[PDB]
Write an enzyme that holds these catalytic residues in place. Structure first.
Site, PDB file in Angstrom:
ATOM      1  N   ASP A  12       0.865  -1.271   0.002  1.00  0.00           N
ATOM      2  CA  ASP A  12       0.060   0.053  -0.074  1.00  0.00           C
ATOM      3  C   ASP A  12       0.643   1.343  -0.144  1.00  0.00           C
ATOM      4  O   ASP A  12       1.644   1.645   0.954  1.00  0.00           O
ATOM      5  CB  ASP A  12      -0.678   0.106   1.287  1.00  0.00           C
ATOM      6  CG  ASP A  12      -1.673   1.249   1.224  1.00  0.00           C
ATOM      7  OD1 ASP A  12      -1.630   2.135   0.232  1.00  0.00           O
ATOM      8  OD2 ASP A  12      -2.751   1.366   2.180  1.00  0.00           O
ATOM      9  N   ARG A  14       0.039   3.976   0.798  1.00  0.00           N
ATOM     10  CA  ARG A  14      -0.352   4.723   1.834  1.00  0.00           C
ATOM     11  C   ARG A  14       0.088   4.260   3.094  1.00  0.00           C
ATOM     12  O   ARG A  14       0.138   5.088   4.267  1.00  0.00           O
ATOM     13  CB  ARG A  14      -1.813   5.110   1.796  1.00  0.00           C
ATOM     14  CG  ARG A  14      -2.352   5.712   0.649  1.00  0.00           C
ATOM     15  CD  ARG A  14      -3.821   5.682   0.411  1.00  0.00           C
ATOM     16  NE  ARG A  14      -4.067   4.294   0.171  1.00  0.00           N
ATOM     17  CZ  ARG A  14      -5.545   4.014   0.492  1.00  0.00           C
ATOM     18  NH1 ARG A  14      -6.376   5.149   0.543  1.00  0.00           N
ATOM     19  NH2 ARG A  14      -5.972   2.970   0.297  1.00  0.00           N
ATOM     20  N   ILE A  16      -0.174   3.277   6.555  1.00  0.00           N
ATOM     21  CA  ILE A  16      -1.291   3.267   7.441  1.00  0.00           C
ATOM     22  C   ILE A  16      -2.470   4.369   7.163  1.00  0.00           C
ATOM     23  O   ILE A  16      -1.922   5.523   6.965  1.00  0.00           O
ATOM     24  CB  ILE A  16      -0.676   3.475   8.910  1.00  0.00           C
ATOM     25  CG1 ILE A  16       0.224   2.360   9.148  1.00  0.00           C
ATOM     26  CG2 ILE A  16      -1.966   3.667   9.768  1.00  0.00           C
ATOM     27  CD1 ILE A  16       0.879   2.602  10.324  1.00  0.00           C
ATOM     28  N   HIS A  17      -3.449   3.775   6.608  1.00  0.00           N
ATOM     29  CA  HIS A  17      -4.449   4.779   6.237  1.00  0.00           C
ATOM     30  C   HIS A  17      -5.800   4.473   6.569  1.00  0.00           C
ATOM     31  O   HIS A  17      -6.255   3.426   6.200  1.00  0.00           O
ATOM     32  CB  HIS A  17      -4.337   5.391   4.763  1.00  0.00           C
ATOM     33  CG  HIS A  17      -5.240   4.067   3.815  1.00  0.00           C
ATOM     34  ND1 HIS A  17      -6.724   4.258   3.487  1.00  0.00           N
ATOM     35  CD2 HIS A  17      -4.976   3.112   3.645  1.00  0.00           C
ATOM     36  CE1 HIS A  17      -6.935   3.395   2.923  1.00  0.00           C
ATOM     37  NE2 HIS A  17      -5.812   2.265   2.993  1.00  0.00           N
ATOM     38  N   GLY A  18      -6.324   5.150   7.543  1.00  0.00           N
ATOM     39  CA  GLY A  18      -7.870   4.941   8.059  1.00  0.00           C
ATOM     40  C   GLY A  18      -7.837   3.602   8.957  1.00  0.00           C
ATOM     41  O   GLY A  18      -6.788   3.648   9.960  1.00  0.00           O
TER      42      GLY A  18
END
Lengths: 165, 129, 129
Positions: A12, A14, A16-18
């Site tokens: 990913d 990103r 860590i996202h959400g």
């Protein structure tokens, strides 16, 4: 094999996202998370923010691909279950070449971009990403694409097969 | 006394010490470091070590840093790891610095000083309302 | 956004802001003052007012000061007294500044921002152990 145990490998851009990291941490029963990326490792500001938002009871680490191969070469984490976070499948093939053992790779998400082809709702692949996935499959490694563990699992080859022949 | 080293991103550590000394008078056995973009934890470990060489660390060392997880914190963490009477406390503020510097002179034990620094730092955050 | 003014004894306020901006990038709608020996609360009230004239105070003003009861605190207290959406919070530290500046952009209500600043300031004080 008698060293660290890869509980799961999530790709990913990103990281860590959400709560994808929160839910995946509890479902994967992971107490440690290691990020492998030279670009992020060079960002001291981003590392601070990721380390300060590391889920409770879970530790987040930031290391480079060369340093990651050495951390795995240490039995200090033998049996320990760690989650590997990558931004591109290219870095995954590199760990395998260093003698890292991977049974399957999970595609969490990939920021779309011009020149790339959209294979999923938020997963994009370029001729380079596809080439890395084909090599992993040729080694008997399973490739599954899924945003959440609650969503249906799709095969990376199947999505790329309906696009690239 | 117990040695105190202050470290923060940028150049705030020297000013937090100056502020404390404006309240309490000049302090002895206190060091500080700065952290500039381009530096890494290894640079900071050297800076901390150079400061420690000038301090009396016989009773212990308390590193007071700006935030949990930043480079100043990470480097200090690597130094205190298997050392007795070495601790790192994040969230440094003036109430913590003033109370800690005041108590230090009454020769408290290391655990007593660490506990007082965390308690006064937290109790020092208060809204007027 | 909600205006933030930082005040400490000495010259630390400017550096605490610089440290925050090193972490978050340059900030808008933030002011600061210094307090030099010889000055009194009335001098500081003027300094705070001159800073406020340059800030957007329509959604409110949060004064973040070093310690409860010092001149910076006393002067800020006299300004917020019968003003809606004006508050003074003592014990300013980097965790408080960073969390507060980050949340401010998501346009929280005044009470929400004040509560977050106190909570993050206190939770930011933590020993490694």
């Amino acid at each position: 094999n008698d060293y660290m145990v890869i509980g799961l490998a999530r790709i990913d851009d990103r990281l860590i996202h959400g709560q994808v990291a929160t839910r995946w941490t509890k479902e994967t029963n992971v107490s440690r998370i290691i990020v492998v990326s030279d670009e992020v490792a060079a960002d001291t500001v981003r590392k601070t923010l990721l380390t300060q938002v590391a889920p409770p009871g879970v530790t987040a680490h930031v290391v480079d691909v060369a340093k990651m191969i050495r951390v795995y070469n240490n039995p200090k984490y033998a049996g320990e279950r760690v989650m590997l976070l990558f931004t591109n499948p290219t870095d995954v093939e590199r760990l395998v070449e260093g003698g890292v053992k991977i049974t399957s790779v999970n595609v969490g998400g990939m920021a779309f971009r011009q020149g790339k082809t959209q294979v999923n709702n938020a997963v994009s692949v370029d001729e380079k990403d596809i080439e890395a996935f084909k090599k992993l499959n040729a080694r008997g490694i399973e490739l599954e694409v899924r945003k959440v563990s609650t969503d249906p699992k799709l095969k990376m080859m199947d999505l790329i097969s309906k696009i690239d022949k | 006394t117990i040695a105190i080293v202050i470290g923060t991103h940028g150049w705030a550590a020297e000013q937090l010490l100056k502020t404390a000394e404006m309240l309490l008078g000049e302090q002895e056995n206190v060091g500080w470091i700065d952290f500039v973009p381009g530096e890494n934890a290894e640079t900071l470990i050297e800076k901390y070590n150079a400061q420690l060489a000038k301090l009396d660390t016989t009773k212990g060392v308390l590193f007071l840093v700006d935030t949990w997880g930043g480079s100043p914190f990470n480097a200090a963490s690597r130094i205190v790891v298997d050392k007795e009477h070495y601790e790192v406390i994040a969230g440094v503020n003036i109430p913590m610095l003033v109370e800690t510097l005041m108590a230090r002179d009454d020769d408290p034990s290391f655990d007593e000083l660490v506990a007082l620094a965390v308690e006064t730092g937290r109790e020092g955050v208060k809204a007027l309302k």
